[model samples]
Target chain A: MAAKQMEEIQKKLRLLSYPRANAPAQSLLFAGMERYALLEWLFFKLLGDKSPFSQQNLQGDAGVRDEETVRIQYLAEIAKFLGITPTVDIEAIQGHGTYEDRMEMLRNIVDLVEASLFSDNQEWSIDEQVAKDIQLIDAIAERQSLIFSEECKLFPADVQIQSIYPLPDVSELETKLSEQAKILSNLQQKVDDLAAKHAYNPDEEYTEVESQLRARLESFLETARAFNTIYTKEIRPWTHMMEVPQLHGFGPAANRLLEAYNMLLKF
Target chain B: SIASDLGFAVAPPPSQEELQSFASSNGERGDDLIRVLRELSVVQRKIADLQVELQGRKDDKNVAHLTHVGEMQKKIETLSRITQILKDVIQNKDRIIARLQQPYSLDCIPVEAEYQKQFSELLMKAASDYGALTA
Candidate 1:
């Protein structure tokens, strides 16, 4: 089972650009440059740069003045990666250990590689990866925007966001309503006063009351129309509970803009 | 002969240990044998001074004198080559370090057929829920 698995990994290594000539021996899989090369490639693939001792670092140990120190360091690193005590020592790595020891180290390394690095076929070279980050974000925005536009169209055309009418302010509408109410009350008082008069001019007083009533009626109509526009455009969407497809990022962006505008109108 | 005449003894060739020690100091290792370069530098300066002396004594016409100068030049040439190799190694290590310093981001792994099927089913359920809500 172990030998067959090694062959499987060997095939994977070839696909991953591990050198053919540097391939390890079947009997002593940890022998020579192949072990370091394979492990380095594994580390590079699994988690880039986390592997402290690179294959090149160990290969260049001849100039570092301590080959044993360098090799032992890498052995310790391998142990760390496997989450095991340093069972496979320097002797196994140097091809001087028992056959079982050699196979044990090879098995451990291959198992880790199979589970982590080669677990899935999704490992495309970065250049070959489809749907880059920007593309994914844009795709989501495109989908949500299409959904948003569809929902907007479902409502009455009058309430659709095509026209740029200023949103009616609640405070401003309340003030206008109050102004109409006061004007109506004042007109009533004047009519009552005119009726109670003992010696008032019939033509001038009646004419003044007619003009005042006309002005007050037109002002009240204007205020009511403004209130109705607010209800139709702004209030109707919330009142009817229209479905707004809350997109990943677009919802927050829209909410912020609406919130700022709301605050501006309130102030 | 000129070096001897000037009271400067002929230095022996650098050992393999000496060369490796110098290479390590110059490379990324910064090993404890950095003093080897210091000693080698003095020898290099001596060789330069001897060469300058030999140039002034070119009229002497002694064969042994020219042989000594050539030997010194050869050793210096070999040392130069080693230092060049060490520099190349340092550059390569630097490149590796730069690559390692970058934060690792997981590449999009391929989803299996079953996983994709499950995902599609999930979306179908979501669509049904949305439909019910809208209805």
Candidate 2:
């Protein structure tokens, strides 16, 4: 059947699995899902009704998924199509490398997918954006997950297929990141301006200044980590819970990070 | 070794300008870092003051004061955000230190000393200014 034909082609490319919560998901590329989408698309001609990836189940409409997690039926279909098994590593992706090494590998995979999907040799194709965004989301989750340890656990097997990890709001994350960077930059600028105002210390040349900055920074980063460990352990429903805090009030990670600063200052 | 006494040592306070001048003379070490610290010390006082007010509100459980709560949270988060930025700058600096094989604490700081008189003066001033925070 066409499903068989679809399988044969999809088999040619890389497929992936969801990773442990609070960790990177292993895939032939960055995160697991986008490559799944890519392989699926390559298998089926496109994302229309005939596309097995999306079903117009009586409960809903079937259209091209706009980077959202696919439904349960599709999860099953994709898993089987990709040959992921139930063993431990089977649920994980397995290319060897440190983070830089892995990303380099990912870029290689990115190159491979482009070559396989298209007839012409184009670089920075649109699909690459999808691959890259998933890359960002995966990384952001791992970094931010440190403070939200309780909420990052993988679901029980029964619920695993139902969007095991809550879908991330990438645009919201993007805004929060940029806003944080901007505010931090402004603070750095303030310090920069202040330092520039000082008379040139022809003698010290800033070795001491840099050292003091390190101390202040040390207590600050150290305290943030310590506070998060305690807060995460002591707080209510700290495990596997927390949604945006406000769909957009403040970033949860930044809130705790700032609280640690507050605590450090108070100290 | 200078910053080793951070939790214990309380320096006498100095004006930002005095501190600036002192730093200008002492090889200008940590002058800007001190400036940021001074500013942050003021911010911490505000946060400390706000914390007191928030506690006071909590003491009156039946008063139903929701409006001021939002205002207070916003202000606190703003200061918190600034400090968070300070934290990031430090983190980035940390990577630089390890690579350069620099000291980690006073190994790092105590204000930054040529005799460190400027450091104690400004930091103590900052301490006294925000001393009420610890109270």
Candidate 3:
């Protein structure tokens, strides 16, 4: 149902004193009638009394025609432009029309007017829509500007930043990101290598190669231990006594000899 | 090929006067675009400065820990992502500007051939008078 739309139309018609409740259909055609007033208002609003219609008025003489005929003709012409077919007949609109017929005429006129204003024939829509779009664009731009201005203010402005007017190409950033990824991966690899090389594992297997190396180390330790034991017991005490005779006296000499003997035992 | 046509290896930056003129011609939105561009320039500088600082920090200490370095790297990545999106937004606005700058057609509901001439005249009048916003 178009009840809601009709309600809005009725409200507007009431504001302008168009007949609604208690008038005969003949009042729609006569001079000084609100219905005729409604017709004149519709002519200017719907068609803009500019060209051929500017010559005629609803009340005035149409040379040989009656005022009622002129008014009916005016309605017919407007109906023609709106593509309303068969044009509500003159006799019905003048006197024979019922309340339903008058109301239906009003409905047709309002509907056609609505269609004309909002239909696809309209141009310059993008002009208005684009204006709204730009408003939103400016809002976003201002927000970004405020955020970056505060964020970047702490750092001193560089000539490199100032030089970028047309904007740097996207490929430049793509290359930069690629290089950063490469460098970051390279760094990670190096870190992994360092960790691998220095790491110790107690769970390591004692293989043939390790056993062979251990044998060689044991043989060297045996020779060094034998030499240390013989030297400390036989030659260390006499050599220590000679060095400390005048300066350190007897206690240091004996102490040094005992220390050498104990060090040999540890091996 | 077009890049070489103007003998430029890269797009050249416009002068302050040229930028202001372009901004004013588009009214307030052009100025907003310019403002965003200016902010983006500062972001670029900030990125470069952070890179320098990151490199310096990497070599300053005896320790090889990456806690701070990793954070700086992440920040750089975030900023680079921000830069990419900002650049895209500017490019989108540029494309829209080009669209509005060009002439476009007005489409209307199809009518019978008998009334086509009159209908065309009607639309023409509407377009000229109040830009076809109303009949």
Candidate 4:
């Protein structure tokens, strides 16, 4: 199973130029978000169970649904490793045309931001700013929710997704999150400042916003890394159970998820 | 006279008188040829010395060594060969000159004497040229 995923990854790698080490993080985040969106769709619209391990056979469903779900999980794990939340609009992702169309759009957005934010190119256009802003917001929200979901689903104690764990003092995590929030707010301010300073025309506001968004996104990257260390080191290790099978699907699906988590560490 | 002048008539021995006469005239001619040979030798030596000095200035020790050793060995062999050839020629000239100075019964005396002289001059010229090359 690991070999299969590796083969897929290798194929993807060959299809493109050598990607940055963090490229997978973006890819995984996008994929995870897409899966999360699909799962949300399956649960809400298709009336599938909301449990992480739903009883329905994903294999029996359309291949698109299964692939999207798996791809999303894979990407989410990557985003998790990078200490960035994958921002995905479940609604936008689900509402996108066909499975392939949605996947392409997701890839484009991921590629654009990954290129703009991660690459050395510091400048961004209005469209880039909007895309980046939306992606950043989605990432933060998704990452927070995933953490919440993972903690709620994995622990034996009853807790809400947003509830703080009483056992291990997550005051440090809270502090880090607060710091990230502050950075995000500062990034937004910078965008506003750039806009006002330039006295950008109404049409050019988009470009200004995009540049600001890109700057904020870039700034947020550092916070994401910091948060990731806390989550992975403090939260994930403490919360995740090696023996428990409650938070994953049955048999093959469970195996795949576990394998993916293990793979995520490797990234 | 000791051997050739005896009634045994093995041959007539030439006297000191004849040897002195031949030596007087031959010495002048030989000295002139020797002077020319010496000049050629000096020229050759100058060429060799210049080559050595050039090599020294170039500071190419290996090339200098090879040139010296190779040329010297060839020179030595040529010298030895020339010396052997000259020894034979000199011996032959002495025999001819001795016969030419004796009281000859045959008319071949002057002709043989002239041949000996020419042969000696030719050998001297060859030797000088060879020595100059070696130098």
Q: Pick the candidate with the highest TM-score.
A: 3
What C-alpha lDDT does candidate 1 achieve relative to the native structure?
Answer: 0.44
lDDT of 1 by residue, A1-267 (tens): 223333344466554334323433332243334345445555345424333554455566675335435565565566566534434442224332332444565556656764675447656744445547568656775686565445434432333222111222243324533544554545453444346355246434444554555455475446446645644464455443333323323455676876676787888
Model 3 chain A: weakest 10-residue lDDT segment is A200-209
Best candidate (score: lDDT) = 3
- Chain A TM-score by candidate, in order: 0.21, 0.16, 0.24, 0.13
Better of 1 and 2 by DockQ: 2
- lDDT of all predictions: 0.44, 0.43, 0.45, 0.44
RMSD of each: 50.2, 41.0, 42.7, 59.6
Candidate 1: give the clashing pairs.
A122-B110
Candidate 4 CAPRI classification by DockQ:
incorrect
Kindly list the interface RMSD, in angstroms, of each predicted candidate in the order they appear: 53.3, 30.9, 20.3, 61.0
Question: How many clashing pairs per prediction, in order?
Answer: 1, 11, 0, 12
Where model 3 places Cα greater than 4 Å from the true spot, the runs are A3-8, A13-18, A22-68, A81-267, B1-135
Instruction: Please provide, for model 2 over A1-267, each residue's C-alpha lDDT reduced to its tens digit, 9 standing for 90 to 100.
Output: 122222333245554222222223334332333533554644243233343434433233343243234453444465454434432333333322222232444555545665787546446566585677677656765775463333223221232222211222243324533544554555554454356447246224333444444455575556657746754454455232234223223443565776666777888
Candidate 2: where are CA atoms >4 Å away?
A1-52, A55-84, A87-109, A116-267, B1-135
TM-scores of the candidates in the order shown: 0.17, 0.13, 0.19, 0.17
Question: Tens-digit lDDT track for model 4 on B23-128?
Answer: 3333223333334335444544544554665566345324644444444444334434643433333346556444433544365566768777887998899988
